[PDB]
């Protein structure tokens, strides 16, 4: 897929949502809450554990897949 994620018809807005979750996880106030609380908050927002794991993975400064979110 890379740039073109096969969604319902167009690209799936999964990446922009994960990007939003990364901003959330990098927030000072948010970082003060227990890990379980941060994950659960993202789950209630509609993200899956797979997407949350990806958000945590990109919340530092890394990119295992050469594309850069």
């Amino acid at each position: 897929g890379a740039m073109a994620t096969p969604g319902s018809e167009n690209v799936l807005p999964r990446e922009p949502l994960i990007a939003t979750a990364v901003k959330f996880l990098q927030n000072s106030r948010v970082r003060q809450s227990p890990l379980a609380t941060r994950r659960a908050f993202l789950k209630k927002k509609g993200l899956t554990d797979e997407e949350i794991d990806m958000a945590f993975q990109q919340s530092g400064t890394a990119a295992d897949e050469p594309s850069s979110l």
């Binding site: 901003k23 959330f24 003060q32 927002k45």
Partner: peptide
Amino acid sequence: ASEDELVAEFLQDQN
């Protein structure tokens, strides 16, 4: 909708 309501709900509730 913006994420502000959520973030604020988040740390205010888990404060």
